[PDB]
Amino acid sequence: TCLLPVEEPLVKKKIQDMEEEVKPGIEEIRWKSTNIDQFISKSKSIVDQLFETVNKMKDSLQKIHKSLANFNVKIIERKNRPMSPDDYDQFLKAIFSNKLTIVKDNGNQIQKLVKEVLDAVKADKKQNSWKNYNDYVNVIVIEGISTAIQTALLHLNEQINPVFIKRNDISPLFDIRLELGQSGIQFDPEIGESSNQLTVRNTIRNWINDFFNIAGTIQRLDTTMPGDFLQEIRSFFEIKQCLAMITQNLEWIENECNQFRARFDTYSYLWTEDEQISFNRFLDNLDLFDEKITHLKAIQQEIS
Amino acid sequence: PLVWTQLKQTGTTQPTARSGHTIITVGKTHIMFGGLDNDKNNYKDGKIAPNNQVFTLKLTQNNCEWRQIACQGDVPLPRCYHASCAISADKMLVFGGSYTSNLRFNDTYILKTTSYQWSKPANQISGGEPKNAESKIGAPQPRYGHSATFFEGKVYIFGGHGGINYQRLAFNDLYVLETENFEWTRLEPKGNPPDPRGGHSAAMMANKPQLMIFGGWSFTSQYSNIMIYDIEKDEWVDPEIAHEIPKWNLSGIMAPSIPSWKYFIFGGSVGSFEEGGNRTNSRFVDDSFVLDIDTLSWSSINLEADETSKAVCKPRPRESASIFYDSGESRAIVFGGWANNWLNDLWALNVSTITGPPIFSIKPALGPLTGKTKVLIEGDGFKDTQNISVKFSGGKLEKEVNGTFVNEKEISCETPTFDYPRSVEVTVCMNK
């Protein structure tokens, strides 16, 4: 009764043979003559063989679940005070490599655990029952990967989304450098998708890819030696909602951020654009020149 | 002009963003039914399942209204990543779905467009239910994300990613079933088969027996090559033309052009890896390549007009997506697909290349400016009698000439006089 539902269908013959084997034994029962020592030796050996095989199958499934939970961890770790965009990729890259290697190590153990079930079950791969069970183990790993990737994306959302950040004392995490540009005010990050050079969206986009990258370590479950896992993880509705939420948060900061950058742009950006030879246009007399010079001194103090 | 535009969907209700949705065109209407909705409004308590809802597609003046029919003789079970093909103009049937990932359906359901009724064909699918392992009556093993190709009197499925019972593997075989009696028969041609692939889109090329399958996803590796199979002689012929970057989960919609049939593939994921290992990285491409069947070569298509943006503007690639092309408006419409977060965005781009047929050659192709002669223009899809016009000159000038159909394949015109002997072209105008 403790055997798993998928397990019994996969190897019905092992359980059925035991039942057929013990079917005569129940009929045999009569305290009048007991040959239980031999009955016991045959029954205990078949039951222990049946019992040990069931435990190995249960142990394998349990081991697969435990490995997936530990591997997701934390996708992003915040090292106290702010550094730089490139710096986060640099500090993050060392952490990402260790996390990726740990996920692969867990995957190798899960793959080996699957091989142990076949040895314990002693069922041919060609038989359909094992094939159905094989897909089921892969599905659990897929479901576990989706949960692990979802947690890492969710952790980024709490840091990435402003409302949670405003309530907390964490405040700033990333660092932005502002340099005056003749064409317009320009940030080191540049606040936009861009699709060229380095930008916060491009970096964040790279960060999102690392969770997706964990797909390669799993290397499927069975049947295909080479298999992808990004197509399956991308298909999950829950993964799409978390990814969609992250994009909305990034767009919100860019809008208000543009308005904050616009206030400086209303006067400072317009000034850089105008040529110096524009002073003559402002003049049109000596009195007018004196008034303009006094206004210019006032403008210098105001600008400082 | 050719550019990517977004058509806002308006109506009583609007279809939710979906990944496993199949859209096909039968007669003058478009019927698309898809599941795997991100919102858990169906089944609930985890194990999200597909929604069996079919919505008709109507687009006028860049305006689309979605109508869903809730009345049917019987309701088919939910389908995920199911190939959909249409027989004649009133018989669209969809086969190959997956329920909660583990369960795969090998059953086939036929829906009549005129009466909006779903029916089971003969005794092929006497009982319909979700079963992990099904191997009786139908020759094809249950599979998901397969390709369905429709030919006169027959339906062919060569898609993989399906397995009998628990075991799952890529499929290297193609099964053809005659729709006259719904008999299912496996067909094994003599020519060496292409490597098994999944999530691949295949369509008939230029109304011919040969059908080309390009770009597939398999556990061992991703294959991006073109294989064409012709029912006659059985063995498929390999063109050997291949896409630059390996592409998988790519959707292709056939477009009809009189000079050469054009095939367009937009979306999908391209990942180049060496044998086993890695393969985690996945890149979505928004650019859609254009292929000419006579040329049998893939040519990248760029947007002629940026609409004053000063940069190319395109919709998200969205990995696997549903794309249907309308012959009347000469435009291809894609509803998109899951790309991390499901997005309900519809983008349709008019194909400038797919110029309307209403020329092959002209004779004579030379003439004297002083002399006046009438030439013969031959080609396809020419108008008969009235409402037929042609162009003249074109060497830094605009001209129109009197013309007359000799047959539906030949036009007679007289050459206009021309001031200068430079370069002269000859084109056609359908007024609109």
Side-chain angles (χ1 to χ4, degrees), chain A residues 1-278 285-304, chain B residues 1-358 364-365 367-368 371 379 381 394-395 403 416 421:
Chain A
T1 295
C2 59
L3 200 52
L4 296 179
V6 286
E7 289 181 335
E8 304 166 359
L10 196 178
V11 65
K12 182 176 181 180
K13 172 179 178 294
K14 283 292 180 180
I15 303 301
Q16 169 192 353
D17 284 0
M18 294 300 293
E19 301 148 12
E20 292 192 1
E21 277 302 349
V22 63
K23 279 181 181 178
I26 301 183
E27 293 177 350
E28 281 191 2
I29 319 188
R30 293 182 183 174
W31 291 95
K32 216 174 137 204
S33 63
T34 84
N35 198 330
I36 294 169
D37 174 309
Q38 158 166 213
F39 177 80
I40 283 205
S41 56
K42 299 296 183 181
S43 52
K44 204 160 310 306
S45 289
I46 191 70
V47 160
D48 285 351
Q49 206 166 155
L50 177 63
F51 183 110
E52 290 196 5
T53 55
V54 158
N55 268 16
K56 291 170 185 179
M57 170 74 61
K58 194 170 184 177
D59 167 16
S60 182
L61 286 182
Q62 172 283 338
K63 204 142 39 185
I64 291 178
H65 292 268
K66 170 58 180 180
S67 178
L68 297 184
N70 289 337
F71 77 89
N72 64 34
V73 208
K74 289 299 178 299
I75 294 169
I76 306 179
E77 64 174 348
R78 182 201 193 107
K79 60 174 298 300
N80 305 2
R81 75 174 186 176
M83 289 196 308
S84 279
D86 180 353
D87 298 28
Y88 259 64
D89 293 20
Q90 291 182 15
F91 167 66
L92 283 186
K93 284 168 186 179
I95 291 187
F96 274 126
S97 58
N98 293 1
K99 271 45 179 55
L100 294 174
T101 52
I102 290 181
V103 169
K104 176 184 176 182
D105 288 345
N106 276 26
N108 295 359
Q109 298 184 5
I110 296 182
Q111 195 57 343
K112 185 167 181 53
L113 288 193
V114 167
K115 287 186 180 179
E116 295 188 4
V117 200
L118 188 175
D119 302 349
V121 172
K122 275 189 175 183
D124 289 345
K125 318 169 191 176
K126 301 178 183 179
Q127 279 206 4
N128 295 23
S129 86
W130 195 88
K131 256 196 180 179
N132 192 31
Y133 166 94
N134 193 23
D135 302 3
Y136 172 104
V137 157
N138 64 34
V139 154
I140 278 202
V141 169
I142 293 199
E143 190 173 4
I145 287 298
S146 71
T147 65
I149 299 175
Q150 194 167 2
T151 64
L153 291 175
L154 291 178
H155 173 81
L156 285 179
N157 184 353
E158 302 172 355
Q159 308 176 9
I160 177 179
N161 89 324
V163 281
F164 181 80
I165 186 167
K166 291 176 182 178
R167 194 54 186 88
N168 285 170
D169 301 359
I170 312 176
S171 301
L173 62 80
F174 255 87
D175 182 341
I176 296 180
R177 213 161 75 102
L178 177 63
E179 288 185 350
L180 281 197
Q182 308 175 358
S183 81
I185 296 186
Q186 300 171 6
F187 303 87
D188 307 356
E190 189 155 355
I191 303 180
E193 296 185 4
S194 80
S195 77
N196 286 312
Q197 63 182 187
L198 189 58
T199 44
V200 46
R201 295 199 182 274
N202 193 9
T203 59
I204 283 183
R205 180 83 164 280
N206 297 358
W207 294 356
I208 297 181
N209 287 15
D210 294 9
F211 306 104
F212 287 40
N213 182 197
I214 310 179
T217 64
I218 298 190
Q219 182 197 8
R220 278 289 187 175
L221 299 315
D222 53 359
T223 59
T224 58
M225 306 179 61
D228 297 13
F229 269 78
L230 179 56
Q231 164 63 186
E232 281 64 359
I233 56 96
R234 288 196 171 183
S235 77
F236 266 80
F237 311 97
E238 312 167 3
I239 288 53
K240 283 192 177 66
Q241 179 192 192
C242 183
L243 190 178
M245 193 170 181
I246 295 293
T247 71
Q248 175 180 349
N249 289 330
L250 297 181
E251 291 187 356
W252 181 98
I253 70 180
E254 176 182 359
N255 299 0
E256 280 199 359
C257 301
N258 288 358
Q259 298 182 355
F260 157 95
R261 62 180 295 175
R263 320 168 194 175
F264 298 110
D265 283 31
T266 58
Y267 64 93
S268 74
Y269 165 85
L270 171 55
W271 293 152
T272 203
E273 276 192 323
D274 305 3
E275 293 177 349
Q276 291 178 337
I277 309 182
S278 60
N285 289 337
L286 300 178
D287 307 8
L288 296 179
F289 262 107
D290 297 357
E291 296 164 356
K292 291 211 66 177
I293 293 184
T294 64
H295 273 274
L296 281 178
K297 294 303 303 179
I299 285 174
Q300 291 201 304
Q301 295 189 2
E302 288 184 4
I303 288 178
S304 65
Chain B
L2 188 147
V3 50
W4 274 107
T5 59
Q6 172 173 340
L7 177 298
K8 59 190 178 305
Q9 303 71 0
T10 60
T12 66
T13 66
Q14 300 186 196
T16 61
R18 297 165 169 104
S19 61
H21 80 281
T22 178
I23 306 181
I24 60 181
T25 308
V26 49
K28 296 184 176 182
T29 64
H30 320 275
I31 295 193
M32 180 171 174
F33 95 104
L36 204 271
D37 311 5
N38 174 9
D39 175 359
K40 291 197 305 180
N41 187 15
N42 274 40
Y43 199 73
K44 314 173 185 180
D45 299 348
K47 208 172 195 179
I48 205 167
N51 300 10
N52 52 22
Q53 296 180 346
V54 175
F55 303 69
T56 64
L57 295 174
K58 297 182 177 181
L59 51 85
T60 59
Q61 297 182 357
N62 295 3
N63 287 334
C64 176
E65 182 170 348
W66 296 85
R67 202 173 183 272
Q68 61 170 3
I69 303 301
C71 294
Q72 293 137 342
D74 289 345
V75 64
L77 293 187
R79 306 283 160 168
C80 199
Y81 293 106
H82 38 119
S84 195
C85 69
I87 307 162
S88 306
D90 308 323
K91 290 207 303 176
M92 293 181 303
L93 69 77
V94 60
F95 146 89
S98 60
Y99 201 88
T100 83
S101 174
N102 296 174
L103 304 65
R104 290 185 296 280
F105 290 38
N106 66 15
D107 58 3
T108 84
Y109 284 73
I110 324 154
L111 161 286
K112 295 303 192 68
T113 83
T114 64
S115 301
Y116 289 113
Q117 297 186 356
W118 286 91
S119 63
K120 52 172 173 295
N123 300 167
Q124 310 311 358
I125 295 86
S126 61
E129 224 281 323
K131 189 54 174 58
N132 282 322
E134 304 181 14
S135 188
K136 189 54 180 180
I137 311 181
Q141 322 294 7
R143 59 191 75 167
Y144 81 70
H146 46 268
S147 182
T149 70
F150 174 79
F151 196 80
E152 159 283 326
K154 281 171 187 175
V155 170
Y156 316 71
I157 65 175
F158 173 86
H161 258 300
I164 196 186
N165 289 337
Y166 291 87
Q167 85 185 8
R168 315 166 61 173
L169 62 80
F171 296 98
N172 179 271
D173 302 326
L174 147 70
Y175 298 73
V176 175
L177 62 80
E178 304 177 354
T179 86
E180 297 177 355
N181 281 350
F182 287 90
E183 306 292 8
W184 217 288
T185 59
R186 180 177 188 174
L187 187 59
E188 305 174 2
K190 305 177 181 300
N192 303 356
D195 284 355
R197 60 205 65 188
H200 84 251
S201 189
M204 304 313 306
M205 74 165 48
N207 302 344
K208 287 177 165 294
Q210 299 182 155
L211 62 314
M212 55 179 172
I213 61 171
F214 156 81
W217 195 50
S218 93
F219 60 99
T220 75
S221 57
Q222 74 309 343
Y223 308 105
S224 73
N225 59 4
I226 302 183
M227 216 58 51
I228 82 175
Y229 159 115
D230 74 315
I231 49 182
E232 195 159 344
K233 186 55 181 299
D234 300 358
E235 53 190 353
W236 60 92
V237 176
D238 304 10
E240 291 185 348
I241 292 72
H243 196 100
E244 306 179 358
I245 301 183
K247 220 161 195 178
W248 74 76
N249 229 356
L250 62 80
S251 58
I253 185 66
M254 283 290 298
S257 191
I258 291 302
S260 284
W261 274 78
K262 299 187 180 64
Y263 185 54
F264 306 72
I265 55 191
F266 158 81
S269 303
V270 297
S272 183
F273 325 106
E274 302 180 7
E275 211 50 1
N278 288 175
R279 177 172 164 191
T280 291
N281 188 344
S282 182
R283 199 171 61 85
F284 310 79
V285 177
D286 73 345
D287 186 350
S288 60
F289 296 81
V290 181
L291 170 162
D292 286 353
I293 308 189
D294 291 20
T295 78
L296 260 175
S297 181
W298 272 114
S299 54
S300 56
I301 212 187
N302 306 335
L303 321 186
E304 186 292 332
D306 303 4
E307 301 175 344
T308 79
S309 302
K310 302 180 300 179
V312 299
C313 168
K314 295 174 298 178
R316 305 175 179 178
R318 302 154 196 181
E319 209 193 55
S320 65
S322 67
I323 196 178
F324 74 107
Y325 164 97
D326 307 15
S327 61
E329 289 204 18
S330 82
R331 72 196 308 181
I333 314 74
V334 63
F335 190 96
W338 157 98
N340 307 357
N341 172 21
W342 293 261
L343 67 317
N344 171 6
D345 294 340
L346 185 68
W347 290 72
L349 76 315
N350 303 348
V351 45
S352 177
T353 305
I354 303 179
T355 47

